RNA sequence: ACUCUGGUUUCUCUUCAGAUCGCAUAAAUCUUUCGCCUUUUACUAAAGAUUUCCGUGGAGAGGAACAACUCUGAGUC
RNA sequence: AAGGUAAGUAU
C-alpha cells in the first residue's frame, strides 16, 4: 500500500445548507510516508512537559530512556539522593491521596 | 431627461390624484437625482407616449413633500404606487410588498403590460390584481 | 469635577421604571430613547467585566442613566499576563482534581430561571449575604509567600508603587 | 449568562459546575441560539469555539 | 565632601501614529475571481481597497492629589 | 429574516 502510495502521490504531483459542526474530510494530516507519519515526540530527555496532558500520565507516557540513562549514569551518591527526593514525592503523593476520598 | 411632470407641494400631489376619472394616476415617489431613479424616470417617459390616454404619470420629491413618506412607508427608491380611483391598488407580482413598485423596470413592454393590467383591474372594481409576471426571481441565470 | 453616588438612588431608580408599560417612565421620551442606541455597547462591557473563577466578587462601579434606561461599566478589564497565565493554570489543576474526584457530574438547566422570571430585585436576593466560595487554591506557604499576600485578585497589588503604577 | 451567575450567587449550585456551563454556553452558542439563521458569519464563531472547546 | 538640580500618582482636554499603534483580533461596504446562482438578508473564500469598531502609544495642555520629601546629574568634586 | 396581506360592502 505504502509503494502504491508513493506512486499515486508522484502521480498527482507531476500528472443554505447549514453544518452544526466541522467535518473530518478536511484533515490534512494523513500522510502515508512513515517518517513524516511517525514523528518521534520530542520529550526533551525527561523534560518534556506536554501542557494539557496529565503529568502523572505523561511520566507514565515518557520513554523512560533519559530517566534511565540517568539512572545508570547515576553515583551511588547520586542514587542514593534520587531515592530520598522519590521516597519524600511519594509520601506527599500519599498525603494529597488521603485528602481525597477520605 | 426627467421632463415629466412634477409634484412642487404635496397637497397638489393630493388633489392631483384625487382628480381623476377613468384613468390611472401612477405616482412615482423618490429622487431625479437619483441613478435608478432615474433609469425608472426614464422608462416612465418612454412609456407616456404610447398609453397616454389613460395612463398618466406624476412624479414626485421626498424632500419636497416629506408629509406622503410616512404614509405608505416612502423609504425606498425609485417606488410607484398605482393610486388609482382613488383606491391604492394591491399590484401583486410575486413580493412581499405587493402595493409598491420599487426598482425600474427592465424593459418598457413589461411595463406597459403591467400598466394595462392594473387599469384593467381598476375599471373592474376589484382593489387586488396579479401580474402575468412573477418578480419573485430576477431570471438572472 | 463629578464624584460617585450611593446605590440606593439607583435602586430606587429602576424600582420606579421597573416596568414601562404604565404611565410612570413615559415622559423619558427621547431622553430614555437616546441611551438605547448605544444599548449593544455597555453588553460588551458586561461580557468583558464579568468575573473569573477566582473573583467572588467585583465591585467595579458604573455609568448609569438620570433616569436609569442604560448603565455602562466604565471598567477596561486589565490583569498582567504573568499572572493571569498562573491563575489559570492553578484553575486547570484544580478543575482536573474536581474531575477526578467527582463521580457524577451535573450541568444545569439552560433556562437560569422560568422563562417569565421577573428582573430579580438588587435588594431582595442579590443582597443574600452568602457568597458560596470561588475556587481557591492551597499553595505551599514557604514556596507561595510572594504569592499568598495578593493573589486570586481582581486587581493584585493595587495602591503598591513598588510594583504596580496603581490605578 | 447574568441570571447564571444570579443563580450562582443565590447558592443552587457551586462553582465548579458553574465554571462548566459557562465553558458549555460559550462553546454552545450555536446550539443554544441558533445565530445561524441570524447571521451566516456568526457560524464561523461557533465553529471554531467547539474546535477551541473541542481541545479544551 | 560642597552649589543648583524639583517630582510621581491622577483626572480630563487637543493633536500625531512612526512602533507586531495591539506579542490580541473583529465586523461593514465596495472591487476581481472561485462554489456561484433562487430575489434581496445573505452567503460560501480568497485576494484588493476603504470604513466603523473594540483598544494603545507619542506629544502637548489644564486642574486635583505627596508637594516638599527631593531623585539625580552637573557644579575640580 | 423573508420571496405566503384575496379583494368588495357599510358599521
Known amino acids: 500500500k505504502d509503494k502504491s502510495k508513493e506512486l499515486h502521490a508522484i502521480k ?4 443554505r445548507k447549514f453544518v452544526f459542526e466541522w467535518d473530518a474530510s478536511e484533515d490534512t494530516s494523513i500522510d502515508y510516508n512513515p517518517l513524516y507519519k511517525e514523528r518521534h515526540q520530542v520529550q526533551l530527555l525527561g523534560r518534556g512537559f506536554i501542557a494539557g496532558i496529565d503529568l502523572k500520565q505523561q511520566k507514565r507516557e515518557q520513554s523512560r530512556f533519559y530517566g534511565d540513562l540517568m539512572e545508570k549514569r547515576r553515583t551511588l551518591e547520586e542514587k542514593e539522593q534520587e531515592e530520598a527526593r522519590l521516597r519524600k514525592l511519594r509520601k506527599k503523593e500519599a498525603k494529597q491521596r488521603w485528602d481525597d476520598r477520605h | 431627461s426627467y421632463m415629466l411632470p ?3 407641494n404635496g397637497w397638489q400631489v393630493d388633489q392631483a390624484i384625487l382628480s381623476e376619472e377613468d384613468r ?74 405587493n402595493n409598491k413598485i420599487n426598482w425600474a423596470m427592465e424593459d418598457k413592454q413589461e411595463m406597459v403590460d403591467i400598466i394595462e393590467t392594473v387599469y ?22 | 469635577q463629578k464624584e460617585d453616588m450611593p446605590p440606593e438612588h439607583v435602586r430606587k431608580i429602576i424600582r420606579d421604571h421597573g416596568d414601562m408599560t404604565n404611565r410612570k417612565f413615559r415622559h423619558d421620551k427621547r431622553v430614555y430613547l437616546g441611551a438605547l442606541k448605544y444599548m449593544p455597547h455597555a453588553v460588551l462591557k458586561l461580557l468583558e467585566n464579568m468575573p473569573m473563577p477566582w473573583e467572588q466578587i467585583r465591585d467595579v462601579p458604573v455609568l448609569y442613566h438620570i433616569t436609569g434606561a442604560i448603565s455602562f461599566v466604565n471598567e477596561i478589564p486589565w490583569v498582567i499576563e504573568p499572572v493571569y497565565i498562573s491563575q489559570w493554570g492553578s484553575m486547570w489543576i484544580m478543575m482536573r482534581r ?17 422563562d417569565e422570571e421577573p428582573p430579580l430585585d438588587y435588594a431582595d436576593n442579590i443582597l443574600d449575604v452568602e457568597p458560596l466560595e470561588a475556587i481557591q487554591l492551597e499553595l505551599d506557604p514557604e514556596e507561595d509567600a510572594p504569592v499568598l499576600d495578593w493573589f486570586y485578585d481582581h486587581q493584585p497589588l493595587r495602591d503598591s508603587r513598588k510594583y504596580v503604577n496603581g490605578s | 449568562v447574568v441570571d447564571s451567575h444570579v443563580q450562582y450567587r443565590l447558592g443552587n449550585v457551586d462553582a465548579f459546575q458553574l465554571a462548566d456551563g459557562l465553558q458549555y454556553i460559550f462553546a454552545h452558542v450555536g446550539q443554544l441560539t441558533g445565530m445561524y439563521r441570524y447571521k451566516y458569519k456568526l457560524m464561523r464563531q461557533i465553529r471554531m469555539c467547539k474546535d477551541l472547546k473541542h481541545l479544551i
Open chain 3, 98 to 114: 474536581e474531575k477526578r474526584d467527582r463521580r457524577h457530574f451535573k450541568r444545569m438547566r439552560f433556562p437560569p430561571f422560568d
Open chain 2, 120 to 141: 384593467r383591474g381598476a375599471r373592474k372594481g376589484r382593489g387586488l390584481v396579479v401580474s402575468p409576471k412573477d418578480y419573485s426571481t430576477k431570471y438572472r441565470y
Open chain 2, 6 to 8: 412634477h409634484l412642487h
Open chain 1, 12 to 15: 498527482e504531483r507531476y500528472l
Open chain 2, 24 to 97: 390611472v394616476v401612477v405616482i412615482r415617489f423618490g429622487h431625479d437625482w437619483d441613478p435608478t431613479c432615474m433609469k425608472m424616470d426614464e422608462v416612465l417617459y418612454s412609456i407616456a407616449e404610447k398609453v397616454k390616454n389613460f395612463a398618466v404619470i406624476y412624479l414626485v420629491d421626498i424632500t419636497e413633500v416629506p408629509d406622503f413618506n410616512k404614509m405608505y412607508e416612502l423609504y425606498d427608491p425609485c417606488t410607484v404606487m398605482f393610486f388609482f380611483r382613488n383606491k391604492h391598488i394591491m399590484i401583486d407580482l410575486g413580493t412581499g410588498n
